[PDB]
Design a protein around this ligand. Structure first.
Ligand SMILES: [Mg+2]
Ligand SMILES: [Mg+2]
Lengths: 44, 116, 109, 53
RNA sequence: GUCAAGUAAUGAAGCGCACAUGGUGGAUGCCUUGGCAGUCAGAGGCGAUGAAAGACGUGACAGCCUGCGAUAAGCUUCGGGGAGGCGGCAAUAUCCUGUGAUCCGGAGAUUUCUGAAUGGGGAAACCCACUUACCAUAAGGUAGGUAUCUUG
RNA sequence: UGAAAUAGAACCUGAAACCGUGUGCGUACAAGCAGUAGGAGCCUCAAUUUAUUGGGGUGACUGCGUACCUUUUGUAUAAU
RNA sequence: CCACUGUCGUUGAAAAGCCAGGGGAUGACUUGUGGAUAGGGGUGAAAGGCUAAUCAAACUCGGUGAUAGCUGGUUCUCCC
RNA sequence: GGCUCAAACUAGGAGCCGAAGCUGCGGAUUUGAAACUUGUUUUCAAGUGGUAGGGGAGCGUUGUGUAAGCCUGUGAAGGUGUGUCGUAAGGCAUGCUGGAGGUAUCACAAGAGCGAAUGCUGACGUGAGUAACGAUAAUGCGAGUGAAAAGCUCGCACGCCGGAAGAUCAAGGGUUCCAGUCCAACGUUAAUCGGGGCUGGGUGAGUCGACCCCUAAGGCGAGGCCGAAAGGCGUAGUCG
């Protein structure tokens, strides 16, 4: 049956992407937190 | 000062498993089962140190009864005859004489029977 | 003396190879080779390969007469297990042991 | 539906006291002299003094 | 020697216990390249001269890590040093080196693209420009400039 | 080769659970926490002027004997 | 597109299916792509339904080692 | 079991069995009492079942000092046997293994002792060589290659789909595509085969699509409005 993840690149990059993170103060805090943890993947 | 438990735990478990040599299955191999089997073995041994003194008197009395009935007396009359004759020979020695020296036990029966 | 061959790491369960080993233990080299070449068990190909290697060792490295040889001792030991995941129904997983075995054969007079 | 205690290794091996590999009957072919499974042709096609290839 | 009556021993499909000898496994002991808590001092920022963080490249040599940026394991210079050397996994080849290499310290040069990202836009590492000067004659190349806000 | 290779690369040491092989003894008429107290026989080392003791392995046969923890008034408990 | 009945399956082929039947099938229809509404909030032809296999208050992190008159566990030895 | 002038009952008598009770013998220990008097000695008397719990005395382990000591390649720690000593925790010696450390004694400090917590991690059992091998569209044989062929290739025959189980895409994936080579692992079996490993190759546009021009929903939004801050809204626009 239909499952929860239905991938779409535009939708992924528009809800979770780098510019979407940088558009908000809270998204920039997400990025600051990911960089402080040292993640090799900042954004999808 | 961190203490590792490995070496002492090992030697501790080896003492128990060594006392459990010859037991069946897990009882000689695995510690949780061996340690109960060793404790129960000690409990049985403590109880049977007491019970062995009862069992051997049981055996001596049986042999003395047989020896006396061979000579025409029961155990309860033979022991009474010994106590009346002031003979202090214990049941262990009397059973030994009855088993391994029939003529001497005949003589003892004669003494008891003369005392009655 | 006793000449050894080892077949460490055969991709099969030692419980399976043990039935083959029990039938060739103590027999002469010829009888044992007959049993192994006409067995229908997979473990027999491994036991036969190890036995052939041991015979060749006894003939080349020790100069023994393979006419008087016999399977002096044989045993199978457990090898390293490969661990795999088996999916089951309802999203539950099982572990799978892909067992291997070590075959030791010693031939001698 | 499942065991209430693990089986002992002794009982596990008594249940395997009937496991046994099958041993084939063998004969010598009269013509070639070769060993073969009884009532089966040799690896090279001989059975009871008769070629097959 | 027959018969009768009575009564031993021997058995192992397999299994148990002990010992011997292995397999598996990776405890223990020893060890350390890594951590943890402080003391005495220093310092307390980096960034429009483009940061932090990245993407993509870059080698004689396929990948990754390290360094570096189309001048791409590096270029110039100033000092140190004196025999080896071309970063690691990790060697191999061509070679360099007393005409002083590799290496270390100071300074400089180069420094792609993204990112405050700042010419506009955007699903970051992409798309699309305007303009000044010069060169080319074709469909471009080189060097710049072009965000917003505040204060003058 | 190496001092060493059951130091051979899954590599120092290499425990236990677990699984083999070998040797000795026991075990196919007998009912249960598998031990314990006795105890025959066998096997094996030593003595000993030579089958007797001592040590080790096994244990026919007899008596007794319903795990452990927790929690309970109270548990072999068919309670955890 | 849906999901009325039954068998099967229930450590499934499947964390909701298969098979045989069943309903709607030009409509208040189904469906693609993009977008909007966010947690005491949303959305709901209303079942407390649904809001990423999570819903009478999502998820993640933090307060936080919440609190727990409750349950479990609590490790060497001997003497009074 | 079996029992009938009992092996039942009543009333008496004499023997004996019978407990970890009492006595005997040996040993330990608590308290008290007496004396060479901080165990220095001997005694004596009364004691010594024990949960919750109170009191007393110790064992071992890691680490610090003692210790620039002492031990140790003539073999440390650890492992694994054996012998021996102590009431116990445990100590001592020693064979084998091991191959570089250990630590007397007395103090001192604890990450100081595990069988349980449906405890945590890893390893390995039992179930058991048991269930299953994922659509009942289906296979047979001959050749080839190969260590090996039911499964690969080729051939003949058979069967299945055919509003697909054929073909073209979008989305999503990202090399899976093609050739050669390999068969450990992966593939629910084998495999010479593969969407597996390894090495090479392969994607060619003015017209197909994107980019680009344009806008929808909906975003962002010089100035502007609003709001403790953060921010929220919104014009022109700019994206989509
Ligand atoms: Mg090792
Ligand atoms: Mg849901």
């Amino acid at each position: 049956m239909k499952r929860t993840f239905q991938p779409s690149v535009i939708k992924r990059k528009r809800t979770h992407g780098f510019r979407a993170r940088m558009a908000t103060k809270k998204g920039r805090q997400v990025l600051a937190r990911r960089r402080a943890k040292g993640r090799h993947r900042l954004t999808v | 000062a961190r203490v590792k438990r490995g070496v002492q735990a090992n030697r501790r478990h080896k003492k128990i498993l060594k006392r459990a040599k010859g037991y069946y299955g897990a009882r000689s191999r695995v510690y949780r089962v061996a340690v109960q089997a060793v404790t129960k073995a000690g409990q049985y041994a403590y109880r049977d140190r007491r019970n062995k003194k009862r069992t051997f008197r049981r055996l001596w009395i049986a042999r003395i009864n047989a020896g006396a009935r061979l000579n025409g007396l029961s155990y309860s009359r033979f022991i009474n005859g010994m106590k009346k004759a002031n003979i202090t020979i214990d049941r262990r020695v009397l059973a030994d004489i009855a088993m391994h020296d029939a003529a001497t036990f005949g003589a003892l029966v004669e003494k008891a029977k003369a005392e009655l | 003396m006793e000449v050894t061959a080892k077949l460490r790491g055969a991709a099969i369960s030692a419980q399976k190879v043990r039935l083959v080993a029990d039938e060739v233990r103590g027999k002469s080299i010829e009888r044992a080779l007959d049993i192994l070449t006409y067995s229908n068990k997979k473990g027999a190909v491994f036991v036969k390969k190890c036995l052939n290697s041991a015979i060749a060792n006894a003939e080349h490295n020790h100069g023994l007469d393979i006419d008087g040889l016999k399977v002096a001792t044989i045993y199978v030991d457990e090898g390293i297990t490969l661990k795999r995941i088996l999916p089951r129904a309802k999203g539950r997983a099982d572990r799978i042991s892909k067992r291997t075995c070590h075959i030791t054969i010693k031939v001698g007079e | 539906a499942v065991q209430k205690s693990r089986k002992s290794r002794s009982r596990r091996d008594m249940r395997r006291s009937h496991h046994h590999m099958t041993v084939a009957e063998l004969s010598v072919d009269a013509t070639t002299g070769e060993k073969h499974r009884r009532h089966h042709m040799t690896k090279d096609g001989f059975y009871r003094g008769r070629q097959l290839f």
